[PDB]
Amino acid sequence: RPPNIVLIFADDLGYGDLGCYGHPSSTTPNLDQLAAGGLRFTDFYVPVSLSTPSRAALLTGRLPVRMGMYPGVLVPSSRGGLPLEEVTVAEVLAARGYLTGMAGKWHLGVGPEGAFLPPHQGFHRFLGIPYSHDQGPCQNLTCFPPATPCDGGCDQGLVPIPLLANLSVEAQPPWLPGLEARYMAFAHDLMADAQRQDRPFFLYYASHHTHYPQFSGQSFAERSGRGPFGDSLMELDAAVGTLMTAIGDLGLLEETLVIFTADNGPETMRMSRGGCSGLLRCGKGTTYEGGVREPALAFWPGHIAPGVTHELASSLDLLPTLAALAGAPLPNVTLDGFDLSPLLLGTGKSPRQSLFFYPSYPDEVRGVFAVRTGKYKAHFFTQGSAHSDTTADPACHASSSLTAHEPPLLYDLSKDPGENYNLLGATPEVLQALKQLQLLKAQLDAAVTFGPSQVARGEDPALQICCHPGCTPRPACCHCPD
Amino acid sequence: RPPNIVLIFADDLGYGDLGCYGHPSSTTPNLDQLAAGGLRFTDFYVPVSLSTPSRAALLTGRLPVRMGMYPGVLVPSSRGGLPLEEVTVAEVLAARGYLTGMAGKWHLGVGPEGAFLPPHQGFHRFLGIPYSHDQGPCQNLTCFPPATPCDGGCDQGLVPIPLLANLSVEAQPPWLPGLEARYMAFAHDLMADAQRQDRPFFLYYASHHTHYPQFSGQSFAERSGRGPFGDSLMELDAAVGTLMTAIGDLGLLEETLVIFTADNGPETMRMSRGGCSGLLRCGKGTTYEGGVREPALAFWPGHIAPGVTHELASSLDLLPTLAALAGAPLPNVTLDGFDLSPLLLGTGKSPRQSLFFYPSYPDEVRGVFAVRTGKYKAHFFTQGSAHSDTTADPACHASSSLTAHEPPLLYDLSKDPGENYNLLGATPEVLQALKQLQLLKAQLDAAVTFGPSQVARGEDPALQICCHPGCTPRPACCHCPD
């Protein structure tokens, strides 16, 4: 019997935000305990530093450029989305007899009649927002009870963020100081129903937590010590605790695999209300470590022994790994990941030796921006980001334009994870690594062909989810609070 | 019966170097275990970001400017040193019937006939170097076995670093790839002798570890994964393990208080061979967090319960704390520290509410550079440092000159520990904190009077420790290897 898989996916969380990663003010007890009793990756990566492309890779196990998930991210009125021809991790597990369920952020397309929503991609049940919770006006929305408004006002001229139950609206806009609870209830029911049916479950919990605007329930409002960002993180942390308690009540601890990760680096433009990359450089939107190296925790009593691993792992590896753990056969399409089960179970080492990073806005001429092989990371092209502004490092700012590098900036991450000292700024070891890194790039650029841009398919405001069909005057008239 | 006190003092170690503090490549098993089974401070500080002044504060529990321990640091031919009129933590414990012993770096003066050496300051036994191990030519010295030279060549035109046994030379220069062992042996004997005499011991272990040049024994050479700096840290870590094993063999675990800390931030000019401040800003030589906030661990089974504390603590508090734990009466002189025993034992909170930081080169006109009260830290004067060069942040570089600030740069460390967002760049809470921080500064500048500069007393090459008295041609002729 395959194990119960619980996949927690954080939004805009940095490498140095969790307590178990050394943050001085963060409050993350549950996550610290999960790490204390399980594997903790120090070198877990994501191919792209943005929500849409990153998530596209997690579910499909393939580089975002293949399925046209570029450039940037999808908006509410986007005409495209994650292709149906694509096979998600939910689809492979469902065929294996898994009760699949997703709670939270999707951001992988909505399309016409909701053709791109979770129910059509392999999930049995679904409760959450079709995209980032800031993609819709929030001037009047309350982020912290009793009545503390969400700063910034969010994306204007849009229909309020809808809380969809499968394919139909449940609220619009939902009550943020209580949206988390709805997810936990949904999660507990999914597991309970799965238990009584003698059927394994799969909970993809894509939290809105630590993405702007920062929100929370009265239970965490001003309780972290790190302010708004802290309270939001404390809620995400508590959500992990409740899921563990629920699994504990059902007596599934040793029969359930829990995994925690985030989609991309910290949005430092949010300043004190944003995440922290720690010692790593830059953040969200950039190909620097701070934006692509995400925290990761593997928990599974009696199977995954507690410790810390410095071995190379990526979000592209989850699908094949989970498929191997569930006995579910891998899809026909070429995956860009590996089976990390040996590493998790402790029977061997990780088969991942190289990592490829693409920019927020890729093209077939420049190709991959950075490649890592072993402890060496080359930067063929560097670029800053608006998401990584307000930092002391000028390289992260939007001011820093796309500059090419020949020879590339070579960094030894084992002794310089902060990417401060360029080696080629020679040694037989270094020189050999260079020729290797240059060849790996050329090989991928030659093989990988960019799939048709889904984002370039245009926008149509008629695709915006409205609570009252044939409403007037749209989109403001689309309403149905709690 | 008072507890056995073991004080491990690291040299040039950053806030983000230990594994338990989130470093991706560091290997520090013993220290990670010590933290896992004891208190771990997230807000432990030092008044000055340099070796000499910092150490002067640890032993005396008073601000370095009081006893004239400025400016900069002491050199081998320095005419001055830590005043004998000063009462060290070794002196108060010795009177309480403690077998005191120091192993490692002193850097608190040597003087004429060695009038400033440890034996005259309260230590019964002593084995170590009178100052930084880089203060003397190292072109020919081997840092890593079998025959790997120390890079940089160190301070030229000086007598080789002497390994003193109390007041007399034992080696010059000593074998670095084996200097650590001599310290451990000395430590084990000190504890053993103390045990049989039914007398409590006090081991001040001031390691040379993570200070340049990086050295190690064959046991750790290329075994950390972080290179030279890593190997050096791995040895320091192992040294902690052996001291614990020794205490375990004597069955003193619950009767011995172990404390680990460092004197100042990472010397980032050493680049990949230097420390890491983590998410904190800048490093050694600066008043920024990266240079004054040091890691700290309190271990004591059955007394100090494992956990993490965000409460304010300083190296200035150790003397009064240890004196309270040993029942030893505090000296007549005014201490700038507090008794942290309630915090350690868990019977109460830390009495420390404010922290004052002085620059590498202070003066009575400008006074304190930065003051912290609660979660707010004000910067009345900012300055970079050569020790903090080669970083991406321009504020740390030596290029950044001493600039005044009116109103001061106000930072909320609870939500901005990286000191990126100046609040005064207003709010009743903030505005009230400002007037408070401004008053605290003015009060200290008015009260504290700078003691006569010991460093300004001049240099005399005749004070250099020579193995062969009346040698020729000095100082090169002063030799006695192992």
Ligand SMILES: *[C@@H]1O[C@H](CO)[C@@H](O[C@@H]2O[C@H](CO)[C@@H](O)[C@H](O)[C@H]2NC(C)=O)[C@H](O)[C@H]1NC(C)=O
């Ligand atoms: C999404 O839709 C499915 C049906 O397509 C719902 O599943 C049923 O849910 C009820 C409880 O509400 C169970 O008693 C049924 O056994 C479920 N049927 C199946 C086939 O699983 C699901 O609850 C819906 N979820 C949301 C959040 O709307």
Ligand SMILES: *[C@@H]1O[C@H](CO)[C@@H](O[C@@H]2O[C@H](CO)[C@@H](O)[C@H](O)[C@H]2NC(C)=O)[C@H](O)[C@H]1NC(C)=O
């Ligand atoms: C420093 O000097 C003291 C004496 O002033 C030494 O202490 C004696 O050491 C021997 C062992 O070598 C013991 O048997 C004696 O009992 C010790 N006497 C006292 C009064 O403690 C000490 O060993 C010397 N240490 C170094 C490193 O030179």
Ligand SMILES: *[C@H]1O[C@H](CO)[C@@H](O)[C@H](O)[C@H]1NC(C)=O
């Ligand atoms: C709140 O104000 C905004 C404009 O600032 C407007 O878009 C929204 O409809 C208003 N809603 C309510 C409930 O007042």
Ligand SMILES: *[C@H]1O[C@H](CO)[C@@H](O)[C@H](O)[C@H]1NC(C)=O
């Ligand atoms: C080694 O060379 C240095 C000069 O580079 C000199 O100071 C030292 O005395 C020499 N020692 C030996 C043992 O060769």
Ligand SMILES: [Ca+2]
């Ligand atoms: Ca994201």
Ligand SMILES: [Ca+2]
């Ligand atoms: Ca030092």
